[PDB]
């Protein structure tokens, strides 16, 4: 990773922060993208709203201009939602489609010509097991993750010839600041609530952000040089339910 | 099917037309929806543009009000786009998402409460093997079909408790006006191109609209009473390629 | 028209789904040859008792049907052994039994049936597999792998033999109301109907399948309405995910 | 990997050899299993026939007895068959089921208790994209690889609680001595031609697969259980 440049979206979140940290430790220079990013330790800061076409279309070019090149993209930004389709509003729809699917589409569409010209690169999409398999009460979340997984596999096959390796990491349960905050606000000790949630996973715990980041780094690395369009599940053995 | 009322979208196209014909022959009353449906023999005509929120939201209620009940919805309307994602325009994106994914969402969101209050019903979505598996140079088409397959499965499990049976038929190659049109534009004689395409199918022929319509009818019939959230592939043995 | 004048072989014909498939086919006008360990009580058009684990019996089944009824249009591979346990609790005997009946036997039957059907202009083969196997489930390793194997075989054969006019597809149930299931409940002092209803509550549809729920899909797959289906794995699960 | 012990089956073959090399380079001690393993640099040699129940049942215990512990099992032995089902002989069936499915079954069944008692481990099965998706004219091969992928996933769920991580790597096209045999068509021309049907633009070398095996055995994959990791260079099954 020494000398390489990476864009990471959703950089202010749990998995995002862990991916940024791991890439910079590995010697990559990293551009960070989220709604707001000024406090994140990174090599280029690109705050913005992914729902705005101009910002998402322009992200890969902004990284190449600011840091001189673009080797890796991690599409990690994502909206969590829930409900049966009958409980899904138009606003829920627009927000999730815009950030979970359209934004990755725009970023990849822009990044690919840059990487092709440079002789190759790696894109890693953070999708979910929810969407590879259907689950109850989360129709919108699943369909956007299924759209993203499909995109990854199609792009993976379309752009392999240009030396661009496009793959996905598909978590299930993940420990994050916001999961813990949710517990605290409802009166639960977050550490205990997290352990209990872990007992529903065959491995016995939910993922830490680093569990996910380590797989992202593998996919971006030369060890994964023959993976194209692969969807790598990282779920501790836990089935969607 | 006697006494039953069905809504069919994309009623003016190849598969839609075969579906309308088959339901009517079997004694159902059919409401037909498409941009224009004036030519079509049917029990209720509902012209409009699926991209319009209010029209899509309103379709199921228009059928229940017009014909007195709503037993079956066939989401058959669909747009074909082609290209690697680097060749996919913003106009392409809006069109495919709006018609292939957002329209079925709006129609199901509206139909489900109506059917639930009436003791159940059946929804059949026409998705595609392209989507279930990735194919070259059709990134947008695949991702919309994968989103629709995922929605089918999630809704199928969310709403089976209300007696609503939601499944999808997933064709691969079908001889339809749009498949032909696509060839002519490129610019091969459609009849020759269709014949050549038929030869790439292990079964030894391209599917006709009736091959698909017969499966849609199965899915809406009592024979399929235990199928919920199933994705029924109808590909003559041919892999996505 | 339809199944009139056609001949079918159904295995596991004394069991729940098998028995429902035999009845439905004969009502639709087909003559049916039944196979199971014992079949004497079964109303059918040819009786072929035997042990599917014996290579000679499984190899010879389609030919015995063609000789006995004059033709072979449809094969329903329905026989299956139920097993459970993590792989660490799976014995060599468990292994030999499940592989022999769930995988090796349909392999032998289809290998023998395909040439006969190819020579006669085509036919239909329907395998009863399981959603367990399509997705993994806890504590049933052997059951799952045999069902996965059968599902894979269905798809490869479906693709390989469609050019011969042979349509090979599978039905994949999840929860089904069988005599083994009901006997199991009866012995725990349960009311089997109530216990069956209770197990139904774990299915989004709200009930487990009756054997007729499954048989009507088997009939669809062997019928003209399914003429464009080759290598399809048709899930019939009432919405219930493997768990 | 320093101080860990791995068992690698099919160790005399292309992928097996590259896996053994990679593990020892990372500091693991490796026991090698195949029909003959005399030539292979390793810390324990366990030659034998996987079709023999006793041999397969005894492999994990032999490694624990010989090197003192068992941390990693790579089920890599495999038999290549071809044909439609109607061209598949009884001998083909026995050979493929025996080596591709029963052997890993026996090995995992024996390895699991040992690993569980030690606090955990990793098992990596080399399955295939063929089997996950169906492909023309290889019915026996596909079904055995499908069986093995299913076993991997079920075992992954069943034994994660004991700290055992069970996963599979699923190659498509790979340049291996065995591929080249069975071609002999001229081998290196055939390998190069096959190479050009892969969107990446080349077929995998054994090291391309071995590096994924190593990832899956490693600490970076500590949250993967029952995952089937495809390594196909973008190439769909066909
Ligand atoms: N031809 C095949 O090989 C292929 C393969 C798999 C699935 N599909 C799908 O099957 C279904 C039927 O389509 P078809 O194959 O008969 O092609 P078709 O064009 O002959 O018919 C599809 C219909 O969708 C309608 N539609 C498109 N945009 C619309 C809009 N903005 N508002 C309202 N209606 C609109 C069209 O006007 C049309 O009549 C679709 O969902 C399609 O994508 C067909």
Q: What is B156-216 written as a DSSP string?
A: HHHHGGGTEEEEEEEESSB--HHHHHHHHTTT--HHHHHHHHHTTSTTSSPBPHHHHHHHH
Question: Is the CB–ligand 1 distance for residue B34 below 6 Å?
Answer: yes
Residue A148's SS3 state is helix
Q: What is the resolution of this structure in A?
A: 2.1
Burial degree of D92 (CB within 10 A; 0-12, 13-18, 19+): middle
Closest CA to D125 of D105, D96, D142, D141: D105
Burial degree of C2 (CB within 10 A; 0-12, 13-18, 19+): exposed
- When divided into structural domains, chain A yields a total of 1
* Breaks (C–N over 2.5 Å) after residues, chain D: 184
The β-bridge relationship of strands B44-45 and B164-171 is: unpaired
Is residue B134 within 8 angstroms of chain D, CB to CB?
Answer: yes
Evaluated on CA atoms D159, C180, C60, C54, the torsion sign reads: positive
Beta-carbon count within 10 A of D220 CB? 19
- What does DSSP assign to residue D99? I
Is residue C115 within 8 angstroms of chain D, CB to CB?
Answer: yes
Q: From CA B59, how far away is CA D61, in angstroms rounded?
A: 67
Q: Taking CA atoms, what residue in B is nearest to A54?
A: B90
Q: Are C76 and C26 in contact (CB under 8 A)?
A: no
Burial degree of C71 (CB within 10 A; 0-12, 13-18, 19+): middle
D115-118 — which CB contacts under 8 Å span 24+ positions?
Answer: D115/D70, D115/D71, D115/D162, D115/D163, D115/D164, D116/D159, D116/D162, D116/D163, D116/D164, D118/D69, D118/D70, D118/D71
Max CA distance (Å), chain D: 50
Beta bridge partners of A36: none
Q: Are D212 and A192 in contact (CB under 8 A)?
A: no
Burial degree of D131 (CB within 10 A; 0-12, 13-18, 19+): buried
Q: How far is CA A203 from CA D38, D156, D165, in A?
A: 38, 9, 8
Q: From CA A115, how far away is CA B29, in angstroms rounded?
A: 55
Evaluated on CA atoms D99, D103, D105, D108, the torsion sign reads: negative
The β-bridge relationship of strands A72-75 and A5-9 is: parallel
Q: Which residues touch A145 (CB under 8 Å, ≥6 apart)?
A: A100, A127, A128, A130, A131, A132, A170, B150
The answer to whether residue D141 is catalytic is yes
- What does DSSP assign to residue D231? E
Angle at which helices A103-118 and A53-67 cross, to 10°: 30
Return the ligand 1 atom nearest residue B177 CA. 20
Q: Is the peptide bond before B187 cis (omega within 30 degrees of 0)?
A: yes
Q: How far is CA A194 from CA A180, A199, A241, in A?
A: 8, 9, 17
Question: Is the CB–ligand 1 distance for residue B97 below 6 Å?
Answer: no
Residues of B in contact with D137 (CB under 8 A): none
DSSP class per residue in C8-56 = EEESSTTSHHHHHHHHHHHHTT-EEEE-SS--TTS--SEE----TTSHH
Residue B29's SS3 state is strand
Instruction: Classify each residue of D148-157 as buried b or exposed e, where b means 16 or more C-beta atoms within 10 Å of its C-beta.
Output: bbbbbbbbbb
The β-bridge relationship of strands D72-75 and D5-8 is: parallel
Angle value at C-alpha B228, between B223 and B230, nearest 5 degrees? 95
Q: Which residues touch D181 (CB under 8 Å, ≥6 apart)?
A: D187
Chain C contacts in chain B segment 22-81 (CB below 8 A):
none
- What does DSSP assign to residue A222? G
Among residues A1, A55, A130, A141, which one is catalytic? A141
Beta-carbon count within 10 A of C14 CB? 20
- What does DSSP assign to residue A223? G
Angle value at C-alpha A182, between A178 and A186, nearest 5 degrees? 165
Ligand 1 center to residue C12 CA distance, Å? Answer: 43
Residue C83's SS3 state is coil
Q: Say yes or no for a CB contact (<8 Å) between A226 and D215.
A: no
Closest CA to B104 of B162, B156, B157, B57: B57
Q: From CA C234, how far away is CA C222, in angstroms rounded?
A: 13
Q: Say yes or no for a CB contact (<8 Å) between C87 and D97.
A: no
Angle at which helices C92-99 and C141-161 cross, to 10°: 20
Kindly report the CATH number assigned to the domain that includes residue C176: 3.40.50.720
Closest CA to D210 of D1, D2, D35, D14: D14
Q: Are D154 and C134 in contact (CB under 8 A)?
A: no
Instruction: Classify each residue of B52-86 as buried b or exposed e, where b means 16 or more C-beta atoms within 10 Å of its C-beta.
Output: eeebbebbbebbbebbeebbbbbbbbbbbbeebbb
Q: From CA A82, how far away is CA A96, in angstroms rounded?
A: 11
| Phi, then psi, of A16 in degrees rounded to 5 | -55, -50
Residues of A in contact with C204 (CB under 8 A): 136
> For residue D77, what are the domain limits?
1-238
Is residue C170 within 8 angstroms of chain B, CB to CB?
Answer: no
Residues in chain C: 243
Beta-carbon count within 10 A of C206 CB? 15
Experimental method: X-ray
Angle at which helices C141-161 and D139-159 cross, to 10°: 150
Q: Which residues touch A134 (CB under 8 Å, ≥6 apart)?
A: A142, A240, B150, B153, B154, B156, B157, B229, C241
Closest CA to D155 of D228, D50, D97, D58: D228
Is residue A225 within 8 angstroms of chain B, CB to CB?
Answer: no
Interface test with B, best of A95, A145, A146 (most B CBs within 10 A): A146
Q: Which residues touch D11 (CB under 8 Å, ≥6 apart)?
A: D17, D19, D20, D32, D33, D34, D37, D40, D42, D76
Q: How many helices (H) and strands (E) does chain B have?
A: 9, 7
- What does DSSP assign to residue A211? H
Closest CA to C8 of C86, C62, C52, C87: C62
> Within 13 A of D129's CA, how many CA atoms are on the CB side?
22
Q: Are D167 and C185 in contact (CB under 8 A)?
A: no
Q: From CA C128, how far away is CA C12, in angstroms rounded?
A: 10
Q: Which residues touch C236 (CB under 8 Å, ≥6 apart)?
A: B226, B227, B230, C171, C172, C173, C174, C209, C213, C214, C217
Residues of B in contact with C171 (CB under 8 A): none
The β-bridge relationship of strands A164-171 and D164-171 is: unpaired
Q: Are B72 and B4 in contact (CB under 8 A)?
A: yes
Is residue D236 within 8 angstroms of chain B, CB to CB?
Answer: yes
Closest CA to A45 of A56, A59, A57: A59
Among residues C3, C132, C143, C185, which one is catalytic? C143
Dihedral, CA atoms, C89, C91, C97, C99, nearest 10 degrees? 70
Question: Is the CB–ligand 1 distance for residue B60 below 6 Å?
Answer: no
Q: Are A152 and A127 in contact (CB under 8 A)?
A: yes
Beta-carbon count within 10 A of B195 CB? 13
> Within 13 A of C162's CA, how many CA atoms are on the CB side?
30
Q: Taking CA atoms, what residue in D is nearest to B240?
A: D236
Residues in chain B: 241
Is residue A228 within 8 angstroms of chain D, CB to CB?
Answer: yes
The β-bridge relationship of strands C31-34 and A72-75 is: unpaired
Q: From CA B124, how far away is CA B166, in angstroms rounded?
A: 6
Residues of B in contact with C219 (CB under 8 A): 223
Q: Say yes or no for a CB contact (<8 Å) between D155 and C87.
A: yes
Residue C59's SS3 state is helix
Q: How far is CA C230 from CA A44, B172, B241, C105, C165, in A?
A: 54, 12, 16, 21, 10
Q: From CA C102, how far away is CA C53, in angstroms rounded?
A: 9
Closest CA to B154 of D228, C185, A83: A83
A30-39 — which CB contacts under 8 Å span 24+ positions?
Answer: A30/A5, A30/A6, A31/A5, A31/A6, A31/A7, A31/A62, A31/A63, A31/A66, A31/A67, A32/A8, A33/A7, A33/A8, A33/A9, A33/A59, A33/A77, A34/A9, A34/A10, A34/A77, A36/A12, A37/A11, A37/A12
| Residue nearest atom 36 of ligand 1, based on CA coordinates | B10
Burial degree of D212 (CB within 10 A; 0-12, 13-18, 19+): buried
Closest CA to A146 of B146, B102, B153, B133: B146
């Amino acid at each position: 990773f020494e000398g390489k440049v990476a864009l990471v979206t959703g950089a202010a979140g749990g998995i995002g922060g862990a991916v940024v940290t791991a890439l910079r430790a590995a010697g990559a220079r990293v551009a960070v993208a989220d709604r707001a990013v000024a406090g994140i330790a990174a090599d280029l800061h690109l705050p913005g709203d992914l729902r705005e076409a101009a910002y998402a279309d322009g992200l890969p070019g902004a990284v190449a201009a600011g840091l001189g090149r673009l080797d890796i993209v991690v599409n990690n930004a994502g909206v969590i939602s829930r409900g049966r389709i009958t409980e899904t509003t138009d606003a829920d729809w627009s927000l999730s489609l815009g950030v979970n699917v359209e934004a990755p589409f725009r970023i990849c569409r822009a990044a690919i010509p840059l990487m092709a010209a440079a002789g190759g690169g790696a894109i890693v999409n953070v999708a979910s097991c929810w969407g590879l398999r259907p689950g109850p009460g989360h129709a919108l979340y699943c369909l956007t993750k299924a759209a993203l997984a499909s995109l990854t596999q199609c792009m993976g096959m379309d752009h392999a010839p240009q030396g661009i390796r496009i793959n996905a990491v598909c978590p299930n349960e993940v420990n994050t600041p916001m999961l813990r905050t949710g517990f605290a606000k409802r009166g639960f000790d977050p550490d205990r609530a997290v352990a209990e949630l872990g007992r529903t996973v065959p491995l016995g715990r939910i993922a830490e952000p680093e569990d996910i980041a380590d797989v992202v780094l593998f996919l971006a690395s030369d060890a994964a040089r023959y993976l194209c369009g692969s969807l790598v599940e990282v779920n501790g053995g836990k089935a969607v339910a």
